[PDB]
Design a protein around this ligand. Structure first.
Ligand code: NI
Length: 341
């Protein structure tokens, strides 16, 4: 049964609610982004209208085989009427195709559902600037002050400079980057760009990337692993055993691996600056964990909410424990008292 924080009151709508069977009263299912915890339940047998971005709809059609007649892509930053209600999709600064949804209820209430997002000051100048929001359904993934990490630009700087130094010292080094979902494509694209290489990957991952509307993508990626000196592998293979095994398959082209695991936050963030990050090494294999986040830090979250001044907040992440729920509610009240709304 579908939980309350996935239902939009006063409408026939649900958000990210595909794993509950046929939801009573739902006339349109919205999908914020193509991550498995959110799409869980979709397939070629789904027969209700799905509303989403263009990029999410490319992935529904090609990867999950949802039939075309049930996919309703909407342009961003554009007022659209769905089943008698005005909605807007906004860029969520998460993975490719990820949106926030603004719903303009028939009774005058305005609701924002962030989906998964990384809050940014540039959102203070979207169509959000123009009106009041009563209710905020918020991605609270990192809603505690211990969760700090650097900008995406600092992390990419670190990766490019690290990869370029290593391969210029040793032209026989291979670079490997982990992946298990869409998102974080800048990591492997920026490293391949500095090295003058395409990114090599499996046919399944190439297919997924071809759905993302990235400019000039045919120039950047390939299924010919032999021609490439940046390879992508499943995140599970980014360990000394998996990397050893991969190096065996490369026909004596390479005598060293430098590998990257983009993680979210890890507790080494509570001590170590990006500048000071070091790898784990065994023999001719080095593995860097890099804190590339596609979710708000605590400070970015707090800044967005203090700017928006919602009348009510409904968390969508960390809702299963009483300790989590109580922690979150304390920070919401601090933020409101400090800012005065
Ligand atoms: Ni996500």
């Amino acid at each position: 049964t579908c939980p309350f924080y996935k239902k939009i009151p006063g409408t026939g709508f649900t958000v990210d609610a595909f794993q509950y069977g046929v939801v009573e009263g739902c006339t349109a299912y919205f999908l914020t982004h193509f991550h498995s915890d959110h799409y869980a339940g979709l397939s070629k047998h789904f027969t209700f209208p799905v509303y989403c971005s263009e990029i999410t709809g490319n992935l529904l059609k090609n990867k999950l085989h949802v039939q075309e007649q049930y996919i309703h892509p909407l342009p961003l930053d554009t007022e659209c009427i769905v089943n008698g209600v005005k909605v807007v999709l906004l860029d969520a600064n998460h993975c490719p195709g990820a949106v926030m949804i603004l719903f303009y209820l028939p009774n005058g209430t305005v609701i924002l559902h962030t989906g998964d997002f990384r809050a940014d000051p540039s959102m203070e100048r979207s169509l959000l600037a123009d009106q009041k929001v009563h209710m905020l359904y918020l991605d609270t993934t990192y809603c505690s002050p211990e969760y700090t990490f650097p900008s995406q630009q600092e992390v990419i700087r670190f990766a490019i400079n690290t990869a370029f130094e290593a391969v210029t010292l040793n032209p026989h080094a291979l670079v490997v980057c982990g992946t298990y979902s869409i998102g974080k494509e800048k990591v492997f694209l920026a490293i391949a760009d500095v090295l003058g290489s395409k990114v090599g990957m499996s046919q399944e991952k190439y297919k997924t990337l071809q759905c993302l509307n990235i400019p000039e993508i045919n120039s950047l990626i390939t299924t010919d692993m032999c021609s490439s000196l940046v390879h992508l592998l499943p995140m599970m293979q980014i360990n000394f055993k998996g990397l050893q095994s991969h190096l065996k398959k490369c026909g004596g082209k390479y005598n060293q691996i430098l590998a990257f695991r983009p993680t979210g936050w890890t507790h080494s963030n509570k001590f170590t600056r990006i500048a000071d990050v070091i790898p784990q090494t065994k023999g001719n294999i080095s593995i860097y964990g890099i804190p590339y986040s596609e979710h708000s830090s605590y400070l970015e979250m707090k800044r967005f909410v203090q700017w928006l001044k919602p009348q009510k907040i409904i968390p969508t992440v960390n809702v299963g424990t009483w300790k989590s729920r109580s922690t979150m509610e304390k920070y919401f009240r601090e933020w409101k008292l400090e800012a005065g709304y």
